[PDB]
Design a binder for this molecule. Structure first.
Ligand SMILES: *C/C=C1/C(=C/c2[nH]c(/C=C3[NH+]=C(/C=C4\NC(=O)C(C=C)=C4C)C(C)=C\3CCC(=O)O)c(CCC(=O)O)c2C)NC(=O)[C@H]1C
Ligand SMILES: *C/C=C1/C(=C/c2[nH]c(/C=C3[NH+]=C(/C=C4\NC(=O)C(C=C)=C4C)C(C)=C\3CCC(=O)O)c(CCC(=O)O)c2C)NC(=O)[C@H]1C
Lengths: 313, 315
């Protein structure tokens, strides 16, 4: 099963109980964005991140009464149609708001049962993706495909290190390709135990295909209330990219000297084949539109891995 | 019966009839569609060899001036990028794309690929979260039918085409429309089936490697290359990989007879085989700009993946 989260007086995690940390329900988010939850029917704002006032520019109480209808007039009917009752928690809808306080915000919404989860992040506003797609497809074998993928991602993102991290049948991990800035350790060829990415992390990564820690030293921002009014239970946040990273994994990243981390799942035959894993030495908020490019690349790599593995077997 | 290609018309080959379809050499027509321009150049020196006859009007230069310069001089910023992206021996399927600001012609999209020692350069005029939203909707579709319906509707919304269909090949190469989105008033093709020869075997082979082709105006005359043969080889210039390549006159007549002014299909490729086509129709001529066509190319790949996934959920 899972332990209760901390804020419901559950045990603190150790290396004795890696597998049982309820990483999906931390009750908090990373501070480079803001999150609101809301009722599926009424559009009634039920929870907000204590930092919402910053991003939205709204007097705190104003929000926690109001309706999405009021708050987002153009958007609220689109949401209603895009995310019908009963849809999967994996389905997401995005829009760009030109919002008074903040030039442009990206809005990302998904639905978990009766709750809409809304994420707001700063945003903005060429051929590198098309060029990359063809490059991946003409790679002659899996090894070269891995090399092209890591190089392409590094060029698109500027990340200090990009790896392709492949799982063995026992969930032992191996770094089979790597693109990195001069003057970093090489992790190419190294293998790591399965407990570095615990089973409950791997399952969540099979369904929700991108996560990140923008700053491995930033404090999480609580949800208020912490419990969902609807249920008097924790809000599931695993489909939210803003979700606070496990402090065990942030300790792991800090001990490695990483300041910013991001990965994309490569899913083949319904299973987690591996990860595009990125490191930055310093804090780094990759903007939403560039993340989208990596999300596309994730799908394309999933296709090409199967194609390429089929021409060996 | 499968038989080798005839020589093209310009090398004294015969004219194509219903008798001998599968032998038209549709990859070497010696000509392009008039809404863009094409140059060929030597892959090592960058000497310009062939050009479409309309090139002066896209590129704003006399032929003899174009042909008298190397790509190093014509494309000083792109020439080194081309050479890195398209190394000798690379496959003909690999494409490099850039946007140019050309004085006379505005923003041009440049698409380049390499066939042996030849570079092929295509120039076309070029111009929010719809793709991301579509990607997730496709993935959440519960079964093959719902996927097919979401895919057709999405493509129609992105493009404005009068008719978008998902055409699926059977094992005997006969095809069947299995989903479609269509303009009000058009008659339905859903559930109809069509003989294997409607798309002959040399087309289906080419459609497994080069995943997007089009006819922007089914009445437009083709524009010859000049000279027609590659001076490197005194042989035909391979245009299988060029979206500007002239469509087969047999196929344009099949389309005009249907009342179609514009056609476009994306290949859906599963396990190395052509599974089906996203096929679109418009009643009037219609040019879809290169950046919009890129969205369809990306959806072609997504759909190939999702078709595998939906079919595996099915035994
Ligand atoms: C008690 C359990 C421990 C634990 C937990 C844990 N680990 C993750 C997630 C990740 N761990 C990763 C590990 C590596 N990154 C590398 O670069 C290398 C090798 C050079 C390794 C072995 C990775 C890539 C992830 C994915 C996330 C990311 O991209 O940063 C989680 C889940 C984090 C979250 O989503 O909140 C958890 C709980 N890690 C341990 O080392 C043990 C002690
Ligand atoms: C004597 C040979 C004939 C022939 C040749 C031919 N056909 C193609 C390619 C295509 N034919 C298509 C046929 C259909 N379009 C539809 O809408 C339907 C059903 C509603 C069918 C059956 C299609 C879709 C294509 C693909 C290209 C496209 O999307 O327009 C070629 C190759 C064309 C080229 O690449 O230049 C050739 C030579 N078709 C016949 O019917 C016989 C008479």
């Amino acid at each position: 099963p899972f332990f209760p989260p901390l804020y419901l007086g559950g045990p603190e995690i150790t290396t004795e109980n890696c597998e049982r940390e309820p990483i999906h329900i931390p009750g908090s988010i990373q501070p480079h964005g803001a999150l609101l939850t809301a009722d599926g029917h009424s559009g009634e704002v039920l929870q907000m991140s204590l930092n919402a006032a910053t991003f939205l520019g709204q007097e705190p109480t104003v929000l926690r009464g109001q309706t999405l209808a009021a708050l987002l007039p153009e958007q609220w009917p689109a949401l209603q149609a895009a995310l019908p009752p009963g849809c999967p928690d994996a389905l997401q809808y995005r829009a760009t708001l030109d919002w008074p306080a903040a030039g442009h915000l990206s809005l990302t919404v998904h639905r978990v049962g009766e709750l809409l989860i809304l994420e707001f992040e700063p945003t903005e506003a060429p051929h590198a993706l098309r060029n990359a797609m063809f490059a991946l497809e003409s790679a002659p074998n899996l090894r070269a495909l891995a090399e092209v993928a890591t190089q392409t991602v590094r060029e698109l993102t500027g990340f200090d290190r990009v790896m392709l991290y492949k799982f063995a049948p026992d969930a032992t991990g191996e770094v089979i390709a790597e693109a990195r800035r001069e003057g970093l350790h090489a992790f190419l060829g190294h293998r790591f135990p399965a407990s570095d990415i615990p089973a409950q992390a791997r399952a969540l990564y099979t369904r929700h295909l991108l996560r990140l820690t923008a700053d491995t030293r930033a404090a999480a921002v609580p949800l208020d209330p912490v419990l969902n009014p609807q249920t008097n239970a924790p809000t599931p946040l695993g489909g939210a990219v803003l979700r606070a990273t496990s402090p065990m994994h942030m300790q792991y990243l800090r001990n490695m000297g990483v300041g910013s981390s991001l990965s994309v799942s490569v899913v083949v035959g319904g299973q987690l084949w591996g990860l595009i894993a990125c490191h930055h030495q310093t804090p780094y908020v990759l903007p939403p539109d560039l993340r989208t490019t990596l999300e596309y690349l994730g799908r394309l790599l999933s296709l090409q891995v199967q194609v390429k593995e089929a021409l060996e077997h």
